[PDB]
Design a protein around this ligand. Structure first.
Ligand SMILES: *[C@@H]1O[C@H](CO)[C@@H](O)[C@H](O)[C@H]1NC(C)=O
Lengths: 49, 49
């Protein structure tokens, strides 16, 4: 997920207001990346044997 | 791109791998405004002319 876009992208004014919350969604872009990585690890653990 | 990686990771050195540093978006080139077809031009001229 692109949280900038999810909340409201392609808008100067939305970005300026998203930023008043700091890392509020940055941490979720991070959490989702971690989940997707874990899903590739699961595939490898099960099939690349 | 390597400096994108270094500031994203808050590091002056980078380990082997892939890191997400940004989000790519194409912006509009032109604006399309289409209002419904007008056949019904208003007869103001019948009073003015
Ligand atoms: C009458 O029609 C003409 C077309 O040549 C237009 O230029 C003009 O605005 C009209 N006259 C008035 C008073 O609206």
């Amino acid at each position: 997920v692109d949280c900038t876009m999810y909340i409201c992208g392609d808008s100067t004014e939305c970005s300026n207001l998203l930023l008043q919350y700091g890392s509020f969604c940055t941490q979720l872009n991070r959490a989702l990346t971690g989940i997707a990585v874990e899903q590739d690890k699961n595939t490898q653990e099960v099939f690349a044997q | 791109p390597l400096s994108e990686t270094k500031c994203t990771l808050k590091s002056f050195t980078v380990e082997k791998g892939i890191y997400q540093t940004s989000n790519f978006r194409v912006q509009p080139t032109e604006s399309i405004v289409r209002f419904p077809n007008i056949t019904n031009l208003c007869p103001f001229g019948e009073v003015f002319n």
